[PDB]
Amino acid sequence: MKRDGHTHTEFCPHGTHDDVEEMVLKAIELDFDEYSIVEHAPLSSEFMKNTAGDKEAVTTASMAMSDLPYYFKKMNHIKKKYASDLLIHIGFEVDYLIGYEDFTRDFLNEYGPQTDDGVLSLHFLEGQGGFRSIDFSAEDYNEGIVQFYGGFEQAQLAYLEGVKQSIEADLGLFKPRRMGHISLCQKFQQFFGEDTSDFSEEVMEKFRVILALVKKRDYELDFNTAGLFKPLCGETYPPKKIVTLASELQIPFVYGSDSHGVQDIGRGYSTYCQKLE
Ligand SMILES: [Co+2]
Ligand SMILES: [Mn+2]
Ligand SMILES: [Mn+2]
């Protein structure tokens, strides 16, 4: 089978603004038979008052609540239009917002019934001046998070504590069961002279605790290839060492392109197949 569990649309303010239809036609050309549209869920307006760092990381993060009816209408149209070629699932990439579980639970209880798939992703941590982005830019990550936690490794461990909290969280019946790109702390790796070759024993132990809990919860992992195409990353989320531990625990992986346009569709698919073997 050939499944992409992680794609975005014209409803993503920071994407290419390519039409989802052109992305779906490209997925069919590359022989995908299953395809999840998991657009960024709208952020809590309370959360957005409590941020620092580049405002664009927050203003551009996701669509507004008022776009949701238009999002569901468009995606449901595309799902039916291409049903004979491609099984399309509709849902969200849901932010795990530390301290805003009530907002996320209320959102999932309201809109969860309109969805068929989901990814729960950590994109924001407490940092200098308030909540800060993990994935906006190397310089913003340095100033907001790395310097705040005391260094690249301290940032890794704060990030993994957030991931662990996302797995433990009670977000009700409609909580996604697929955890998004669980090594996103490596997106700007090379800016700090870091790579996946030298994870400390403490980082490794934190990954083992996270994988044991994923297995106990019967969750699965986003095998996310976007990192291969980020100029300061060069790695899958997660890397091979983590993939091997997860596979030994029989945690399922779903390939995720994290596509924000047509050119992203299918990217790193061969690397997914090989990295699993
Ligand atoms: Co995504
Ligand atoms: Mn995005
Ligand atoms: Mn993400």
Paired with 221 in beta bridges are 179, 253
276: CATH: 3.20.20.140
C-alpha 134/C-alpha 13 separation (Å) is 18
C-alpha 179/C-alpha 145 separation (Å) is 21
Q: How many Å lie between the centroid of ligand 2 and the Cα of residue 113?
A: 23
Q: What percentage of the chain's residues is helix, strand, coil (to nearest 5)? A: 45, 15, 35
Structural domain of 220: 2-277
Q: Give, in order, the Cα–Cα distances in Å from 228 to each of 36, 68, 110, 248.
A: 20, 31, 35, 24
Q: How many Å lie between the centroid of ligand 2 and the Cα of residue 170?
A: 24
CB atoms within 10 A of CB 121: 29
C-alpha 100/C-alpha 105 separation (Å) is 9
Q: Is the peptide bond before 239 cis (omega within 30 degrees of 0)?
A: no
Residues 161, 154, 129, 187, CA torsion sign: negative
- Please provide residue 238's backbone torsions phi and psi, each rounded to the nearest 5 degrees: -90, 175
Q: How many Å lie between the centroid of ligand 3 and the Cα of residue 134?
A: 10
Report yes or no: 62 and 13 within 8 Å, Cβ to Cβ: yes
Q: How many Å lie between the centroid of ligand 2 and the Cα of residue 60?
A: 9
Count up the domains in the chain and report the number: 1
Q: How many Å lie between the centroid of ligand 3 and the Cα of residue 146?
A: 19
**From which experimental method does this structure derive?**
X-ray
Q: How many Å lie between the centroid of ligand 3 and the Cα of residue 113?
A: 22
Q: Give, in order, the Cα–Cα distances in Å from 15 to each of 135, 153, 259.
A: 14, 30, 9
Nearest bound ligand to the CA of residue 258:
1
